[PDB]
Amino acid sequence: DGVGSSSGNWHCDSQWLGDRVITTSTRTWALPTYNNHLYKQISNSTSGGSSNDNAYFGYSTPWGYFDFNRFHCHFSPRDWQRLINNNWGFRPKRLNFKLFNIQVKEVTDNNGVKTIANNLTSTVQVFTDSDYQLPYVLGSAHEGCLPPFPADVFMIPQYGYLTLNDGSQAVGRSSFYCLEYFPSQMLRTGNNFQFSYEFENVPFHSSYAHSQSLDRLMNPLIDQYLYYLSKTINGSGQNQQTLKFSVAGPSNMAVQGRNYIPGPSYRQQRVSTTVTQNNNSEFAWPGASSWALNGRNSLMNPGPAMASHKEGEDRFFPLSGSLIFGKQGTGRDNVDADKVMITNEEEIKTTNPVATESYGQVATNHQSAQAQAQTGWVQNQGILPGMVWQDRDVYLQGPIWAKIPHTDGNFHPSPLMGGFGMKHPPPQILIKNTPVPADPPTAFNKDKLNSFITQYSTGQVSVEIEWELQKENSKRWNPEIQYTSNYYKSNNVEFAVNTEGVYSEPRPIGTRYLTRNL
Amino acid sequence: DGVGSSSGNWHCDSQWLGDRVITTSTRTWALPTYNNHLYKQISNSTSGGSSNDNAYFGYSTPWGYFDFNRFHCHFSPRDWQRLINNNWGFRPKRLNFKLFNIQVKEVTDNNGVKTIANNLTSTVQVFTDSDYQLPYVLGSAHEGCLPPFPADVFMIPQYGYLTLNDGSQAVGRSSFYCLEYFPSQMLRTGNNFQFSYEFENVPFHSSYAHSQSLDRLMNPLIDQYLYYLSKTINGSGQNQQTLKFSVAGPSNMAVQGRNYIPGPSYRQQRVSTTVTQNNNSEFAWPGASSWALNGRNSLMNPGPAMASHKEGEDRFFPLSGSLIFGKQGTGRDNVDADKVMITNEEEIKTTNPVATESYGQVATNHQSAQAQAQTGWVQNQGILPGMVWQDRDVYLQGPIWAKIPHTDGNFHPSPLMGGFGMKHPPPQILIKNTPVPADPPTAFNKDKLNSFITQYSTGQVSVEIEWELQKENSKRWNPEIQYTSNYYKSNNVEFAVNTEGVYSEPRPIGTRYLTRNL
Amino acid sequence: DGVGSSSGNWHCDSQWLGDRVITTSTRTWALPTYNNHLYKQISNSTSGGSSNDNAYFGYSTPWGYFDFNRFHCHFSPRDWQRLINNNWGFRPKRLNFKLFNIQVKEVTDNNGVKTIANNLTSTVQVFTDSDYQLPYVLGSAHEGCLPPFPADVFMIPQYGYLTLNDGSQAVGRSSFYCLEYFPSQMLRTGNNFQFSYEFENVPFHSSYAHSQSLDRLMNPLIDQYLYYLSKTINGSGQNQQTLKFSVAGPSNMAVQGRNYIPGPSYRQQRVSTTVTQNNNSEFAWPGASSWALNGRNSLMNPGPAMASHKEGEDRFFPLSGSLIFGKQGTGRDNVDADKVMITNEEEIKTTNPVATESYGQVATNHQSAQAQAQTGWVQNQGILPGMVWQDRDVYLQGPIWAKIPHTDGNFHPSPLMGGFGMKHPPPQILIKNTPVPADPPTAFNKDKLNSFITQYSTGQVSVEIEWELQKENSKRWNPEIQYTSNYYKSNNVEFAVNTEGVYSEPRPIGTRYLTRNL
Ligand SMILES: OC[C@H]1O[C@@H](O)[C@H](O)[C@@H](O)[C@H]1O
Ligand SMILES: OC[C@H]1O[C@@H](O)[C@H](O)[C@@H](O)[C@H]1O
Ligand SMILES: OC[C@H]1O[C@@H](O)[C@H](O)[C@@H](O)[C@H]1O
To answer: Which GO terms describe its cellular component (chains A, B, C) (predicted)?
Structure first.
């Protein structure tokens, strides 16, 4: 419309209907010029680091993008609690996005003091990649998200992508993308932008833990009608061999026949938070579970979902097998365990094998009168018919969704870091403020113009997501575990602002509190 | 209605339509009072046995439940034969249940002689758990089923369940259930009960065996157009290396290219019924294939479906890899092989690996001029794209269905003991005769009344199941294997009553007789 | 609309209809940035002062709010006089609020000389808390109100709130509020804001004084038919005891029977404005009437409404029992009595006990032949059936309304400082100018942006209140006390501007001039 009118309003409310929640968040953003208006080839050679596992080839762009893909973007800690205490499941349904109240500003510097003024005629240009024609960066869990606390003003992250490489070099199959080669909407002060999105059908996340374990499904009062082999020798001596069979029953539960077995396993190395119990050596990379692709070793960071420890073993965690979040103000490199938050998958110990344990034992030979029976430990176990498992839990700090890679086949394409896998996830919103040249020469030159006016833009983003809820039907008599605040005398309220104005999130909050039968 | 009228009739017929069978069974039951009208916390501590694998925590209830979940409940041996000889497949469709002609009886004992009288005003109360809000006990294969022989009167089994535990202790996530906290129908003599159930869509059980093996699918008369590496050395000597390639053809079938491979394997230890061929040692538990869950080892009793032995090896069976049924009158503990019936999965040797064999071999290294080629045995193999398998066979003595555990994911949720997996299986029917207090004090006391009239109830159950049939279309010229009775001079007719009045089932009858092409 | 159009007009008129008055006020405001765009935890620890009575915990916000909650906002001194001379009562009815002609301005400073320019694209955001979901700050009588004189330009006060504390620490029950978590309307130059409000039904304020006292309601000419005990002894001597009864009549009025008694009392310490008559000691805090809450002592500042002094005792006032207003230009701390204005409740001496007196006397024992009759002084008296009282008077300088605390119970929830109590008072209007970032880095950083453009906003506020009037019906023959200006030779007109341009209010003006029968 015009310079004097606001093109949108601040909308942060969240409304709770019966089966649905609608969260709306508004933030203030700032967009710098990136790469001096250039596309740039980037590689580990451009970075200077040399390792085959770390080699890459790609491009950085002048563009930037919006990321609302963490839950704390859409939920207050109080709202998150209302979700996880009262519901068996939730999934996203619809999405609404807005850009409004856009301000482009010119920066003028002369002797070292800078002046900021409005440039009213400058434009910022925006588009969504709806056909998923760009490398999709939102699936990897990166920073640059809308801040969890509504009063914080955030910088928009720079867009870049990777393609095929051999070492630092490219190959003919490597592809280059100019984002100017897409249609984008141009917006001056007084123009606004919006689009809507429908989440494709996904299963509900399971916000519950099981109140039963897969190995105790039976009636403790009744015998099975099935027999197992109890004795193979009549006693001590020579040539003592029998086949004795017993009924499986309450007295021996481990031996009963069962219809279903725990899910797959890929074993992790066990690390103690008590430090004297760890080996004295550097095992971090060497002792790590990894997978190889085209000669590169990728550490298996969030591998298959597994129980992080056995009972009472809480000090133990898998080496890379769990999500690790930083506390507010935590540095980038070589930080103590105190400054990081290690989440645990403990609730899924009912259907899932422990991450640091073998799956089980198998027979490795044929016994005979000559040969004793030999077993071996199953370190990794793929899917078997009759396996049953839970996915990884969801966190208020964690990612909401991921893009399922477009491929001939996949199995159970739930994101291993967590959340909802989608062939067509919420599209990428790419934003850039358009280059404004400085004064060109007065005689013609064919070289592209490398001299521009220093600018940046600010504005507001609204994101609205509808969430479908799955209510708890339970007949459980005794009360249940809920997420609570503790009452006792803190210096600071948790999930509140600091005395210096800093918002922090004291601990990770998982989704799984309510219980179901297994 | 009233004391003098029958509230139902005896209905045992089974009617065979073209595509469907309807089996109806009627039995007479007796219901005791369980637990002295109490709910009781039970654990391995209450049982006194201590092993971490066998530890449990749960509750026993005053309630009891009906189990018709074995096939011999619904099929006579003659009906079972008509099913398995004439049909390629079957599945359950509808279910109808009735309770009628209910009689509550008071037991009076004074000096040690007891008198039984009718209590006409007493009531028995019944409900089905339709929302699956209770721990589901019918999936584990327990005793307490309707007896296979219609003239036998059976005792109703006591209901109980398990929940989470650490050792014998519970955890806050453990859940307690009062069955009085459900609505239930009360029934006096003259009241009857019924409900209907729809089986959710399940695949047909495969009542056939394959007439082809997965490794012979080819035309024996024709060569492939594909080549394999036949020779790696030109001959004996030094520096003799070649690559020689041959056509795969009828002469060498093992090396041909194939589109599909056999199903997954988890290896079992091999045990001989000839006893002198077994090792002299106790390998039963130690040499057993197991899986671990939260620190407990559960023996893998009916693991993935696998051929129980190779050809001519019938004396061999997997250590726990097969269902083991007892003969009539067989004791509970340490019984000889003669008194038990070991079933075999032999028919599936066409698509499935043998339970006691390795899946195959893989390369463990890179060969080179320095290093010879090394292989290793694959003891367990998870699912691979292109695998093809058969499920475990169904038995007249075996379970019909199971409840699929409610979870984020599962694969091929066919019950490993056998039958039809269902998210919503036939619901549990829970029955209890209501407590009738003895004479209370004449001055008020707040304690709950612990003194009751000794009672029990009897009545009849009808169960009606419709089964959908899949007829055989085969073009096979030669006659086929059928299930038969042998003609020769027994002292007793098989599947008949004893001279003392005892009904026995002489052998397990599987489903797989007719054949199909693979 | 646009940059060149005014979005509202100046409206200050007040129109007098028969039963209603409509006051409209327009002011010019200025809004700074508060807290550097931060929320900040604040406590007596952050302030450094330590006393348990003064301990607090809370938050300061970047937001600010409008306060029109004093009468001089809505009434000129002439209008106030027209109200209080002609009417028995008044109450508020409707409310209309407007924000318009909004101007955001950028402040640029380099070498220490600052330049102010218009920022045309900046926005200010406004919302009302209509659901009363925020801590309500307008009830406490704070500064920051619209100035009484229309030509003064006022600064908008900063919003902040308190929550639960133990000492300077918080508790788990303490709650934090982000105001960005509400929907708010954004407004650029050319946008305006308005909303309407309905006062919920409140009683009229009593703008009258009683022309009778509660202890003289009788006919002075007539006797009562009731008797009192006049004599207990026949005379001087031993064993002189009688019961003598007399008629209560005009000669002895104190002893007559009465249907109604004066209202409740909580006694205050008496302080003289003649200073030599006060004790020589510091009794201010020590000799003060207080109430205790959770271990803290809160001085009872405007306690129950009571007559401030007896007749002719005008020099006396309760220690904290009355509202104390400052004269124009009066300092914050340790100011002489000359610079402050002490109001008096004198008019209510008819129905209300004096603040500095005991309520009365009660019997403390049983008299007998052995024991003389003993009485004791009633220092505080709660409500009794048959009590009758007046509320505190209203002042042109005083507060209009208060929010009744949301609670299970309350009694006579009239605000003790004065005015109209409401469960849903006029809502809080919260205003903030939105942060405009300075130029962000050209490489992405995840830290929130702490660098902003210095801004402030100005504009106009209109407030329109309809007041319902209660006209005087009186039959009084003699003329009545009115509020007047004195005619005699001042250097300055009262309620006028200074010679230096300063507006002052010379004295407090109460509401109670006209009289009624009691
Ligand atoms: O040699 C490959 C390297 O890979 C890196 O990811 C790791 O941090 C190094 O310690 C080393 O393992
Ligand atoms: O040590 C665990 C035990 O588990 C039982 O199920 C088994 O019968 C024992 O022989 C032993 O293996
Ligand atoms: O000891 C509590 C204190 O409370 C304050 O409000 C007062 O000004 C002090 O003089 C003292 O009474």
So the answer is: T=1 icosahedral viral capsid
* C5 Cα to chain A: minimum distance (Å): 10
Q: Which residue type does B34 have?
A: Y
DSSP reduced 3-state for C449: coil
d(CA B166, ligand 2 centre) in Å: 18
Across the interface, do A116 and C439 touch by the CB < 8 Å criterion? yes
Instruction: Find the radius of gyration of the CA atoms of chain B.
Output: 28
Q: Which residues pair with C466 in a beta bridge?
A: C22, C94
Bridge partners (DSSP) of residue B206 are B89
Minimum CA distance residue for ligand 1 atom 9:
A285
Mutation to test the C interface, candidates A493, A503, A505, most C Cβ within 10 Å: A493
B335-336/B316-318 β-pairing:
unpaired
Question: Which residues in chain B (452-511) have CB-CB distances under 8 A to chain A?
Answer: none
Give the bridge partners for C43, in sequence order: C57
Q: What are the CA-CA distances from residue C155 to residues B74, C65, C106, C432, C460 (Å)?
A: 88, 10, 17, 13, 12
Tracing tokens 């589901």 back to the chain, one arrives at B136
**List of chain A residues whose C-beta atoms are within 8 Å of the C-beta of residue B63:** none
User: If we measure between CA atoms, which residue out of C56, B257, B220, B292 comes closest to residue A378?
Assistant: B292
Helix, strand, or coil (residue A10): strand
Contact in structure between A242 and B275 (CB atoms under 8 Å): yes
Dihedral Cα A271, A272, A273, A274, nearest 10 deg: -150
Residue A86 parent element (H or E): helix A77-86
Chain B partners within 8 Å of A88 (Cβ) = none
Distance from CA of C51 to the nearest CA of A (A): 17
B residues 359-398 lying closer than 8 A (beta carbon) to A: 377, 379-385, 389, 391, 397
| Assigned architecture for domain B1-518 | Beta Complex (2.170)
d(CA C127, CA C137): 15
Kindly determine whether residue A34 and residue C166, on different chains, have CB atoms separated by under 8 Å.
no
Q: C311 Cβ partners below 8 Å, 6+ apart?
A: C349
CB of A53 closer than 6 angstroms to any ligand 1 atom: yes
The alpha carbon of C80 is separated from its chain's Cα centroid by a whole number of angstroms, namely: 17
Bridge partners (DSSP) listed for residue B186: B125
Check CB contact under 8 Å for B326 and A225.
Answer: yes
Q: In angstroms, rounded to a whole number, what is the distance separating the alpha carbons of residues C409 and A448?
A: 77
Nearest-5° Cα angle at C210, C254 to C485: 135
Terminal Cα distance for chain C, rounded: 58
Among the partner-chain residues A34, A150, A497, the one whose CB lies closest to the CB of C40 is: A497
Could you give the C-alpha distances from C491 to C326, C496, C501, in angstroms and in order? 21, 11, 14
Greatest extent of chain C over all pairs of C-alpha atoms, in Å: 109
Locate the DSSP E strands across A343-404: 360-363, 375-378, 380-381, 387-389, 401-403
User: Are B314 and B344 spatial neighbours (Cβ–Cβ below 8 Å)?
Assistant: yes
Query: Touching check for A421 and chain B: CB below 8 Å?
Result: no
Altogether, the residues listed in chain A come to a count of 518
Q: Is B344 one of the annotated binding-site residues?
A: yes
Rounded to a whole number of angstroms, the CA Rg of chain C reads 28
Q: Does A260 touch chain B (CB under 8 A)?
A: yes
What distance in Å separates the CA atoms of residue C81 and residue C64, rounded to the nearest whole number? 33
PDB experimental method: cryo-EM
| Per-residue 3-state assignment (H helix, E strand, C coil) for C376-430 | EEECEECCCCCEECCCCCCECCCECEEECCCCCCCCCCCCCCCCEEECCCCCEEE
Rounded to 5 degrees, φ, ψ at B247 are -75, 135
Resolution reached, in Å?
Answer: 2.7
- Given a contact cutoff of 8 angstroms between Cβ atoms, the answer to whether B251 and B339 are in contact is no
Determine contact, residues C230/C245, Cβ cutoff 8 Å: yes
The three-point CA angle C428-C429-C431 to 5° equals: 135
